[PDB]
Every structure is written in structure tokens, then in C-alpha cells.
Amino acid sequence: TIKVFTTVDNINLHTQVVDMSMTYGQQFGPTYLDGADVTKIKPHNSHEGKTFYVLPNDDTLRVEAFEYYHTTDPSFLGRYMSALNHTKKWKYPQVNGLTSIKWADNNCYLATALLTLQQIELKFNPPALQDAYYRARAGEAANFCALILAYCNKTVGELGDVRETMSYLFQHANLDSCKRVLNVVCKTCGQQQTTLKGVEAVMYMGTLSYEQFKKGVQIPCTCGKQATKYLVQQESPFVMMSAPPAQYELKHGTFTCASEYTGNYQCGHYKHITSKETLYCIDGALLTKSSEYKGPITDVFYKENSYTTTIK
């Protein structure tokens, strides 16, 4: 018989004593050791003193689970420990001072998401996302990538969209202070102004150029008259301009970072473009610098503080 520790958050540890006769699944229930499902493994002698992850079996550990993860989904813990099993085996090299991921199990969209988050100002609501965020910026993003897969309901090897991944992450972040008012000018319906807050205030699908969104885009109205939806005010620390993959010229200093997508729908590859003193191209561990860039771009990230248009 040995003494081990069970926890749901790895912050509040609960001490337990197990017996060699019964497996972990008998006493604790579903138990995981650093990602490995040890529900069907009997306690070995080298397990004394180690910390174990267990699904909440009483109301005390149910609350500790929400305090750290902000979810009551029982399958969340299983998916998270399943994703951690391959993410802890990935390589996370430092590419130009940023933490990237070497290609493995179709993680090109995770590497682009990781590199992007290190360049935008974001505060996660779940403490598990925030603590792993800080650890990712240091250079240990294994737990962070596992949580992204869990929160996005994706599995390892699955094909993921960087915009959809960011969309899920923004809903678990504090964007309540973000606002965006728009003005749609219709030739028949007249003038109508809407106001977006939260996640829908920092994302737009249709164009990549933030200047074009300021000048106005042609969106169809119900009567057929193409309204010129232009941005009026934007109080957000960043904006994401998304558009279907198309050839786009990127210039250093005009944007923060971009997502390159090459290949067919869903079965393709993601490369991350970032702007410094010169344009950099990060593909896993590979790095390519250039003064100009032209290629297929799906998302472009810009910086913002407090903007008000000059169009009436």
C-alpha cells in the first residue's frame, strides 16, 4: 500500500492511500497520470508520492473543477487528459523569440494559434487557460495546447480552422470591454447603426484589409441595395480580419501577424506570418525572413486602442 495525491486542478491536492490489490479504477475511478489513463493499472511501487488526476466523485472536487476550468462537462477532463498525451510529446522550439510547435499530428493550426496568442493582449477567464498561457509564453506550452483541444472539442490529428479555434478561445476570454459600432447605409432602407460587443466586436469575415473595413464594404441588404458597412468606432486591443484564402500582399509594419493557408479545403497546411523589423515566416521550427510577402492569407491581426471614423 502506497500514498498518492488526487486532484482535479493540480492546485488543490488531496492525499489518499491506495492498496496494491485493487486498481486505480476501483478506488479513485477514472484516474490519469500525466496524461496516461491508469484506470486499469494497479498501483506500482514507483507511484508513491506522485500526483494523480481523477474525475470529480463528490461535490467538493466538482467545485474545484469549475473554479479552474469553467465547465461542468464531465467529458472535459477525459478529452483534456487524452490531448495532453500527445501534446506532452511534441517539440516546442523557440522561433524568433516565440514559442512554436514542430509539425506533428496535423498541429499546423495549433502552432499558428499559439504563435498568434503570444502577440495579442488576451486575458482568459478559466484559470487553467491563463496559467497554461503564462507557462506557454515561457516555453512550456504542452498543457496549454492540450487545453485548447479540450475547450474547442477537437481531438489530436483532427483538422482545425485557426479562425474557429480563435473564436472558441475568445468566448473564454474577457472581451466585455470590447465594443464595435457599425453603420450600414442602405439606398432604400435608409441609415441603420448597430453595436457589437464581446467576441463579435473583434472578428469580421469578408475582408483582410482593416483600411477597407474602415472605408466600407459592400454587403447586400434585404431589399437588394448593397449597403456600405463601414466601421464607426472600435474600442478593442486588437481586431481579427478574416476572409477566405486569397492572394494578399503583406508589408512589414502594416499588421501584427497573419495566417497563411495553402492547399485544399480542410486538407491543407497553415503557416504563420509575423511582422517585426522585417517580415518573418514561421512553419513549425522553420523560419524565413523577407522584406515583402505575397501569398494566400486567411486571417490578418491588427493592433487597436480607441478609433473613431471621420465619415458622415
Ligand X SMILES: Cc1ccc(OCCN(C)C)cc1C(=O)N[C@H](C)c1cc(-c2cccs2)cc(-c2ccc(CN)s2)c1
Candidates 261, 280, 293, 302: give the one binding ligand X (CB under 6 A): 261
For the record, the C-alpha cell of 22 comes out as 485493487
Contacts (CB under 6 A) with ligand X, residues 143-162: 159-161
Angle ∠(214,220,222) on CA atoms, nearest 5: 130
Q: Give the bridge partners for 235, in sequence order.
A: 179
Is 186 flagged in the annotation as binding?
Answer: yes
Instruction: Judge contact between 300 and 258, C-beta under 8 A.
Output: yes
Among residues 86, 108, 257, 299, the one annotated as catalytic is 108
Beta carbon of residue 79, minimum distance to Cl ion (angstroms, whole number): 16
Within 13 A of 190's CA, how many CA atoms are on the CB side? 3
**Residue 160 contact partner, candidates Zn ion, ligand X, Cl ion, none, CB within 5 to 8 A by sort of partner:** ligand X
Is 265 near ligand X (CB under 6 A)? Answer: yes
Site string for ligand X, 84-103 (x = CB under 6 A): --------------------
State yes or no: is 108 an active-site residue.
yes
**Residue 221 contact partner, candidates ligand X, Zn ion, Cl ion, none, CB within 5 to 8 A by sort of partner:** Zn ion
**Which stretch in 14-22, 43-51, 233-241, 261-269 sits in contact with ligand X by CB under 6 A?**
261-269
State yes or no: is 269 an active-site residue.
yes
Distance CA 107, CA 145 (A): 10
Is 145 flagged in the annotation as binding?
Answer: no
Instruction: Judge contact between 194 and 184, C-beta under 8 A.
Output: yes
111 phi/psi in degrees, rounded to 5: -65, -40
Instruction: Judge contact between 130 and 124, C-beta under 8 A.
Output: yes
Could you identify the residue written with the cell 499530428?
Answer: 105
Beta carbon of residue 69, minimum distance to Cl ion (angstroms, whole number): 9
Residues 8-20: b if buried by 16+ CB within 10 A, e if exposed: bbeeeeeeeebee
Beta carbon of residue 288, minimum distance to Zn ion (angstroms, whole number): 5
Is 152 flagged in the annotation as binding?
Answer: no
State yes or no: is 145 an active-site residue.
no
By beta carbon distance, the residue nearest Cl ion is 125
Strand pairing report for 217-220 and 226-235: antiparallel
Of 225, 231, 283, 279, the closest CA to residue 252 belongs to 279
Query: Which residues of this chain interact with Cl ion, rule CB under 5 A?
Result: 70, 125, 172, 302-303
**Residue 186 contact partner, candidates Cl ion, ligand X, Zn ion, none, CB within 5 to 8 A by sort of partner:** Zn ion
Q: Which residues are annotated binding-site positions for Zn(2+)?
A: 186, 189, 221, 223
Q: Which residues are annotated as a binding site?
A: 186, 189, 221, 223
Residues with active-site annotation: 108, 269, 283
Q: What is the binding site for ligand X (CB under 6 A)?
A: 159-161, 164, 244-245, 261, 265-266, 268, 298
